[PDB]
Structures are given as C-alpha cells and as structure tokens.
Write a protein that binds this ligand. Structure first.
Ligand SMILES: C=C1/C(=C\C=C2/CCC[C@]3(C)[C@@H]([C@H](C)[C@H](CCO)CCCC)CC[C@@H]23)C[C@@H](O)C[C@@H]1O
Length: 240
C-alpha cells in the first residue's frame, strides 16, 4: 500500500542517516580525551560528542525531503529546538539495556549514568532520560521507523518561533503519514500494535526532556568557566 514517493522518502532518510551516523564511531577519537576519576571531568569530552552530533543532525536535516523548501529562518528555528531531542533519539541506537549505558565500541567510549552525572547534570534529568532510552528501545523500531521519527521530530509546526507552520506541517504530515502506512504494511504484529501512537508519545517525552534541559543548561552556562569548556557550536545552538 506504499506509494513510490513514500518508498522514496524511506530511501532518502535511510541513506541520509547512514551519511550522518557512524556505527564505528571512529570520529570519537578526535574529541578531547574523557576523564573518569572529578568535578565535571567529563564535560570536555561529552561537550564535543554533542557538538559533533549537532553537526550530524544538521546534515541529516538538510536531506529531509522538503526541508530545503523551508525558509532559512524556520530551518534555524526547527534545528535549534530539535537538536537536543534528535540527539537523545539517535543516541538510542547505541544505547544498551544490558547495563543501561551508551556503548560506542571500546569501553573507552562507553558512557553510563556516572559519566552523564560527571558532566554537570543531576539525576533529575538523567533518570527520565534513561527511562526514555529504555522505553524507546523496547519499541524495537525498524531503521525505517527510526529515521522517520527523527525527521518528524525536526519539522514540527509548534516549535516556538516558526512562521511558516503550515508548510512545516505539510512536510511533517507527509512524513508522518509515511510512518503510519509503513507500520501497517512493513511492521507485522504484535510489534505493530499501537506502534505509531507509542512513537508519537516519545516525541511528547522529548518535549519534556528538552524543557528540563534548556533549563538545566542555563544554570550550567551561568558560570563562564563551564561555558568555557563547551564548543562555539554548542553555545550558538543552545542559546547564549
Ligand atoms: C551523542 C550520541 C551518543 C550518546 C549520547 C549520550 C551519551 C553521553 C551523554 C549525552 C551526551 C547526554 C547529555 C549529558 C545531555 C545533554 C547536555 O547538553 C544531558 C541532558 C539529558 C536531557 C545526551 C545524550 C547523551 C553516541 C551515539 O549514539 C551517537 C549520538 O549522537
């Protein structure tokens, strides 16, 4: 029941992801060396992982079918607000339930609760984050489903600052209606049960994680000594 345009959207976003995500995580070796002893001894390293990811989320965003049609300003608005949610999403791909940590190959680049807490974030935001990571992992989404959710997360009309929300909406609907149809045809039961409703619910959780983030970030940035460990990209994107 899938059209060729939808088949096209799937081919695009999958390739677009493969271009923006490295399963070897070889680039992780360029980041500032991680230190586990230790006040914020991980902010330097993880600050680079985030900023690296932000770049890769932008490249993925550009390849979003129809995203180019948006006005330069809206594109600035969507990514500035989705960047963090998209990161938390694309992170799930390396998240494991075996020990509740992000595993990116070597134990050196394996991140757990104490590493995120050692980056300047309390358990108040880490707890709901890991919960989100588990619930999103339980879904066992297909890669086709994974890549769509990320895109739909990018082009959201209700993002604060959006002007051409209707056109932003026309694009999200086209992607969304692609996800719905895919789950019907391509995703067999029981794993297909309410699969869509559960994916949309995760975007509602990200709005929450994002809201507690941009908040807990302003307090992490109040000290020019912490905002001195970040990268120019992280500062420019997560507000100054
Ligand atoms: C960044 C990624 C990866 C893992 C993500 C992590 C592990 C370390 C800690 C990170 C950077 C978290 C970071 C401390 C968060 C944002 C701070 O600006 C903490 C707030 C939680 C909402 C978010 C994603 C986490 C690896 C791979 O899946 C690629 C992906 O882009």
């Amino acid at each position: 029941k899938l059209s060729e345009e939808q088949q096209h959207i799937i081919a695009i976003l999958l390739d677009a992801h493969h271009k923006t995500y490295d399963p070897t995580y070889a680039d992780f070796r360029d980041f500032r060396p991680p230190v586990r002893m230790s006040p914020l001894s991980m902010l330097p390293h993880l600050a680079d992982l985030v900023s690296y990811s932000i770049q890769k989320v932008i490249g993925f965003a550009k390849m979003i079918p129809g995203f180019r049609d948006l006005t330069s300003d809206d594109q600035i608005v969507l990514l500035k607000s989705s960047a963090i949610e998209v990161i938390m999403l694309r992170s799930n791909q390396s998240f494991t339930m075996d020990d509740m940590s992000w595993d990116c190959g070597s134990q050196d680049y394996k991140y757990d609760v104490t590493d995120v807490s050692k980056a300047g974030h309390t358990l108040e935001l880490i707890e709901p984050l890991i919960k989100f990571q588990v619930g999103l992992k339980k879904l066992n989404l297909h890669e086709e489903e994974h890549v769509l959710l990320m895109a739909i997360c990018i082009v959201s009309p209700d993002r604060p600052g959006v002007q051409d929300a209707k056109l932003v909406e026309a694009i999200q609907d086209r992607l969304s209606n692609t996800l719905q149809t895919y789950i019907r045809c391509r995703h067999p039961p029981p794993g297909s049960h309410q699969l869509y409703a559960k994916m949309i619910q995760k975007l509602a959780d990200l709005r929450s994680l994002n809201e507690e983030h941009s908040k807990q970030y302003r307090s992490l940035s109040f000290q020019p000594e912490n905002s001195m460990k970040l990268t120019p990209l992280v500062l420019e994107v997560f507000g100054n």
